[PDB]
Design an enzyme around this catalytic site. Structure first.
Site, PDB file in Angstrom:
ATOM      1  N   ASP B  25       0.690  -1.246   0.178  1.00  0.00           N
ATOM      2  CA  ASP B  25      -0.029  -0.082  -0.027  1.00  0.00           C
ATOM      3  C   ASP B  25       0.736   1.364  -0.113  1.00  0.00           C
ATOM      4  OD1 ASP B  25      -2.630   1.076   2.031  1.00  0.00           O
ATOM      5  OD2 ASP B  25      -1.887   1.868   0.249  1.00  0.00           O
ATOM      6  N   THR B  26       0.705   1.910  -1.168  1.00  0.00           N
ATOM      7  CA  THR B  26       1.668   2.959  -1.521  1.00  0.00           C
ATOM      8  C   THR B  26       0.998   4.511  -0.738  1.00  0.00           C
ATOM      9  OG1 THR B  26       0.590   3.613  -3.608  1.00  0.00           O
ATOM     10  CG2 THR B  26       2.669   2.426  -3.420  1.00  0.00           C
ATOM     11  N   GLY B  27       0.036   4.316  -0.142  1.00  0.00           N
ATOM     12  CA  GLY B  27      -0.741   5.255   0.535  1.00  0.00           C
ATOM     13  C   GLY B  27      -0.698   5.223   1.856  1.00  0.00           C
TER      14      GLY B  27
HETATM   15  C1  LIG Z   1      -6.644   6.944   2.931  1.00  0.00           C
HETATM   16  C2  LIG Z   1      -4.834   6.900   2.913  1.00  0.00           C
HETATM   17  C3  LIG Z   1      -4.364   8.211   3.114  1.00  0.00           C
HETATM   18  C4  LIG Z   1      -4.279   6.077   4.408  1.00  0.00           C
HETATM   19  N1  LIG Z   1      -5.123   4.760   4.359  1.00  0.00           N
HETATM   20  C5  LIG Z   1      -4.460   3.673   3.244  1.00  0.00           C
HETATM   21  C6  LIG Z   1      -5.392   3.327   2.195  1.00  0.00           C
HETATM   22  O1  LIG Z   1      -4.411   2.707   1.185  1.00  0.00           O
HETATM   23  C7  LIG Z   1      -6.373   2.598   2.685  1.00  0.00           C
HETATM   24  C8  LIG Z   1      -6.069   1.059   3.071  1.00  0.00           C
HETATM   25  C9  LIG Z   1      -7.253   0.468   3.480  1.00  0.00           C
HETATM   26  C10 LIG Z   1      -8.021  -0.580   2.685  1.00  0.00           C
HETATM   27  C11 LIG Z   1      -9.038  -1.217   3.066  1.00  0.00           C
HETATM   28  C12 LIG Z   1      -9.568  -1.107   4.131  1.00  0.00           C
HETATM   29  C13 LIG Z   1      -9.184  -0.109   4.962  1.00  0.00           C
HETATM   30  C14 LIG Z   1      -7.821   0.704   4.562  1.00  0.00           C
HETATM   31  N2  LIG Z   1      -7.437   2.446   1.581  1.00  0.00           N
HETATM   32  C15 LIG Z   1      -8.561   3.189   1.721  1.00  0.00           C
HETATM   33  O2  LIG Z   1      -9.311   3.965   2.617  1.00  0.00           O
HETATM   34  O3  LIG Z   1      -9.236   2.941   0.408  1.00  0.00           O
HETATM   35  C16 LIG Z   1     -10.619   3.586   0.568  1.00  0.00           C
HETATM   36  C17 LIG Z   1     -10.856   3.864  -0.925  1.00  0.00           C
HETATM   37  O4  LIG Z   1     -10.968   2.625  -1.615  1.00  0.00           O
HETATM   38  C18 LIG Z   1     -11.653   1.772  -1.163  1.00  0.00           C
HETATM   39  O5  LIG Z   1     -10.999   0.458  -1.086  1.00  0.00           O
HETATM   40  C19 LIG Z   1     -10.256  -0.016   0.121  1.00  0.00           C
HETATM   41  C20 LIG Z   1     -11.144   1.017   1.169  1.00  0.00           C
HETATM   42  C21 LIG Z   1     -11.577   2.231   0.456  1.00  0.00           C
HETATM   43  S1  LIG Z   1      -5.154   4.178   5.853  1.00  0.00           S
HETATM   44  O6  LIG Z   1      -5.456   2.857   5.769  1.00  0.00           O
HETATM   45  O7  LIG Z   1      -6.187   5.034   6.496  1.00  0.00           O
HETATM   46  C22 LIG Z   1      -3.398   4.112   6.778  1.00  0.00           C
HETATM   47  C23 LIG Z   1      -3.142   5.349   7.353  1.00  0.00           C
HETATM   48  C24 LIG Z   1      -1.800   5.550   8.027  1.00  0.00           C
HETATM   49  C25 LIG Z   1      -1.080   4.433   8.021  1.00  0.00           C
HETATM   50  N3  LIG Z   1      -0.024   4.386   8.747  1.00  0.00           N
HETATM   51  C26 LIG Z   1      -1.604   2.999   7.258  1.00  0.00           C
HETATM   52  C27 LIG Z   1      -3.010   3.148   6.595  1.00  0.00           C
END
Ligand SMILES: CC(C)CN(C[C@@H](O)[C@H](Cc1ccccc1)NC(=O)O[C@H]1CO[C@H]2OCC[C@H]21)S(=O)(=O)c1ccc(N)cc1
Lengths: 99, 99
Positions: B25-27
Site C-alpha cells: 500500500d503506497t498510500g
Molecule cells: C487513505 C490513506 C491516505 C491512508 N490509508 C491507506 C489506504 O490505502 C487505505 C487502505 C485500506 C484498505 C481497505 C480497508 C481499510 C484501509 N485505503 C482506503 O481507505 O481506500 C478506500 C478507497 O478505496 C476503497 O478501497 C479500500 C477501502 C476504500 S489508511 O489505511 O487510512 C492508513 C493510514 C495510515 C497508515 N500508517 C496506514 C494506513
C-alpha cells in the site's frame, strides 16, 4: 515514470481544468477526492476505510490527467484525509508495483 | 516481480510463526497489521484515514519477510480491517510504482 517510496507518492492531477495534488494509493480500490464541485449527475454512495464509513458523491466517467496520463472513470467526492488516486484509475494509466 | 493493480495487491508476509496476506500500500506511511500479540516494547499511536482514526500499538525493529524479501522496521498493530504493508517496509524490499 518510476516513483520510489521514501516520500509520499504525491502527483499533480488535472480535473475540470483545476490542478490538485493527489496521493497514488495502491491500497485504495477507489479514487476519492476532497469536497469539490463536479458537473453532471451523481449518486449517493457509502465507502469504508481504516476508520469506518463515510458518505460520498459518486461521479462516473470523469476525465483526470495524472502526470500527463489520461484516465476517464469513477471519482468519489467526500471527507478523505487527502485526495487519493485508487486502483480504478491507476490501472487505466498503466501503473504497476515492481520490486 | 510485477504486481498488477487489476486486483488488490495482496502478498504473503511472515511475522514470526504467522503467515498473513497483506496489501502493498503506497498510500500507507507505515505498516499496520491486524490485531496480534507481539513481544516487546511498544508505544500508543492514533492513525487516521477514511472514516476517522484507529488506535494502534507501535512496535519498532520488527523483522517481517515479504514474498521472501527481508525487512525490519516499524509495525503498527491494531483493529485495521486489512493487513497493510506501508512505505516504511516497501522501500526496504525495493518496491517502486511504474507507469
Ligand atoms: C487513505 C490513506 C491516505 C491512508 N490509508 C491507506 C489506504 O490505502 C487505505 C487502505 C485500506 C484498505 C481497505 C480497508 C481499510 C484501509 N485505503 C482506503 O481507505 O481506500 C478506500 C478507497 O478505496 C476503497 O478501497 C479500500 C477501502 C476504500 S489508511 O489505511 O487510512 C492508513 C493510514 C495510515 C497508515 N500508517 C496506514 C494506513
Amino acid at each position: 515514470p518510476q516513483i520510489t517510496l521514501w516520500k509520499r507518492p504525491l502527483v499533480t492531477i488535472r480535473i475540470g481544468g483545476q490542478l490538485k495534488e493527489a496521493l497514488l494509493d495502491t491500497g485504495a480500490d477507489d479514487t476519492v477526492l476532497e469536497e469539490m464541485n463536479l458537473p453532471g449527475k451523481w449518486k449517493p454512495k457509502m465507502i469504508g476505510g481504516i476508520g469506518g464509513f463515510i458518505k460520498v458523491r459518486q461521479y462516473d466517467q470523469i476525465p483526470i490527467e495524472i502526470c500527463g496520463h489520461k484516465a476517464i472513470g469513477t471519482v468519489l467526492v467526500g471527507p478523505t484525509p487527502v485526495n487519493i488516486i485508487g486502483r480504478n484509475l491507476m490501472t487505466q494509466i498503466g501503473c504497476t508495483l515492481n520490486f
